[PDB]
Amino acid sequence: MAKVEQVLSLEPQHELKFRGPFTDVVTTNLKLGNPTDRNVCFKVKTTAPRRYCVRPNSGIIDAGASINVSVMLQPFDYDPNEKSKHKFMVQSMFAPTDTSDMEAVWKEAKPEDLMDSKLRCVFEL
Amino acid sequence: MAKVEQVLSLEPQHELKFRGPFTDVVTTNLKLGNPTDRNVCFKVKTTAPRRYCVRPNSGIIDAGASINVSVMLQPFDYDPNEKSKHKFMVQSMFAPTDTSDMEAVWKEAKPEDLMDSKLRCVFEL
């Protein structure tokens, strides 16, 4: 408000699942897609930095393009009945029609120019 | 010509191996040792930041303690011929017997105070 709903498609769109055993590093794709005629800068943020790694974490997705984001979980001791309270977030933003790059753009970005989307987390097995 | 050779112990010592298929993220551990009575600060760097991830990429190893560093390689088209020219750099420096944090310490650490060691990278299968 007046916040523009997310332009990017996500897949999955609501939650990211992880298949154990969580003996080793477990990984899962998030696919982002750009259905517009402008490039869309993105950031992929996480609730537990020390626990996850995102590749790519940021970037510009060309117009009409899709990229696969690797979300990677570090090994740990599962706990079956536990609930996963990690959230993953995608911040997007059209790389301004005249943009020089994607440097200090983020800090000076308005709340209007920003498009957010949060995803839940689930463990498995 | 100064100063010190790496305090820590690396395992593997020389060369990180990665086993295919590289259709998906590939992880190999580095296990860092701290044989000493003083906390060692580390920073694990690599050549291909958008190609690798390092959990943990920085931090402190308690005195006499070990850390297994997850080093994760992103999916890609693999040749069998192609060689790997990727280098993994672990930086280290004692956390002074009286220090208070590790914020600016890196940007004001000397070159002889600093501690480096380079690891080859190898792709398999």
> How many distinct structural domains can be found in chain A?
1
Model resolution, angstroms: 2.5
Interface touch B53/A56, C-beta < 8 Å: no
| Contacts with B75 from chain A: Cβ below 8 Å | 68, 70
Question: A103 to chain B, minimum CA–CA distance in Å?
Answer: 17
- The region, left, alpha or beta by phi > 0 then psi within -120 to 50, assigned to residue B119 is beta
What does R_g of chain B's alpha carbons equal in angstroms?
16
Look up the CATH number of the domain holding residue A29: 2.60.40.10
Question: A53 to chain B, minimum CA–CA distance in Å?
Answer: 7
Other Cβ atoms closer than 10 A to B24: 14
Contact indicator for B106, B43 with CB cutoff of 8 Å: yes
Structure solved via = X-ray
Would you state the structure tokens that stand for residue A75, as one six-digit string? 């090994």
Interface touch B70/A27, C-beta < 8 Å: no
Q: Is residue A32 helix, strand or coil?
A: strand
Around A34, how many Cα atoms within 13 Å sit in the side-chain half-sphere? Answer: 21
| Contacts with B27 from chain A: Cβ below 8 Å | 24-25
- Which domain range does residue B43 map to? 1-125
DSSP assignments along A3-56, one per residue: PPPP-SEEESSSEEEEES-TTS-EEEEEEEE--SSS-EEEEEEES-TTTEEEES
- Identify any residues that bridge with A125 across adjacent strands, giving them in sequence order: none
Type of residue at A112: E
Q: Which burial class, exposed, middle or buried, applies to A107 when counting CB atoms under 10 A from its CB (0-12, 13-18, 19+)?
A: exposed
Sequence-ordered list of residues with C-beta below 8 angstroms from that of A37, at least 6 positions apart, any chain: A63, A64
Of A24, A55, A56, nearest to B27 by CB-CB distance is A24
